[PDB]
Each structure stands twice: as C-alpha cells, then as structure tokens.
C-alpha cells in the first residue's frame, strides 16, 4: 500500500545509548546530560519528502530528505554525510552512512529505530502521541 510516517512520538526506552554515542565520538559530557531524557520527536511526511525532527538526548535535529534522493544528513556528532534514504515495504526507512546502519520501523503506534555500529545495537523505542 502506501503508508504515513507523520506524528509526534515520545521516546519511550532505548538500549545502548552510552556505548553507541560513546563509539561515534560524542563527548562524555553530553552523554551524561543526555542519556535519560526521554523527549519528543517529529516526522513530517509529503509523498516521498520526509521531514525528521529528532530530539537524541541533549540535543535537536532536524533533517529532511527524499526517499531515493541523495541527501546530506547531519549526524549526531554534528558532522554531515552524504547518503540515501530508502523505503523497505510499507513500514521501514533504512539508510547506512559511514559505517552506521539504521533502520526505522513503524507498527502502529509504535516507532522503533536500530542503529547497528559494529556490534553495538542503538535501539530507540517511541509511541504516537
């Protein structure tokens, strides 16, 4: 078919936030500050054109981009990287940049991202509101 993305999602557990930030090269300050905060993130969708508004721990990001498109994704570290965004079936956004891939699942309610570094799972779990 052809599913919608768009939502509030409150952030409502996650796994590996400390090592996966601590691998990307994020600073220890920043990962004590933000590791327990469990805040709110936005998905706008048009058609192909999504919108992401992610708040990860102590900061905001906000990219856009279009599904098979290449696109410059600002990284947690701040740092930008060129890649595409892609639909899998009805329900998934997958993109891999670096050596980081992420996958973005939503059943229902629930949004549920894993982002695999190594054998680090970053695995973030969210619910409509």
């Known amino acids: 078919s052809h599913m919608s993305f768009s939502g509030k999602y409150q952030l409502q557990s996650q796994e590996n936030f400390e090592a996966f930030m601590k691998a990307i090269g994020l600073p220890e ?8 905060i469990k805040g709110v993130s936005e998905i706008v969708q048009n ?8 708040t ?22 701040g740092e930008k990287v060129k890649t ?13 940049f670096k050596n980081i891939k992420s ?3 939503l059943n229902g309610d629930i949004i549920t991202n894993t982002m695999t570094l190594g054998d680090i799972v970053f695995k973030r779990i969210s619910k409509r509101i």
Do not use: P, R, W, Y
């Not at 595409?84 to 891999?96: A, F, I, P, R, S």
């Open 47 to 54: 058609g192909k054109h999504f919108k992401f508004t992610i």
């Open 103 to 105: 996958v973005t699942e």
């Open 84 to 96: 595409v965004v892609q639909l899998e079936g009805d329900n998934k956004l997958v993109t891999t």
């Open 56 to 77: 990860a721990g102590s900061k905001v990001i906000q990219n856009e981009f279009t599904v098979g498109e290449e696109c410059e994704l600002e990284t947690m570290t």
């Open 29 to 36: 300050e920043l990962i004590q500050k933000g590791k327990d």
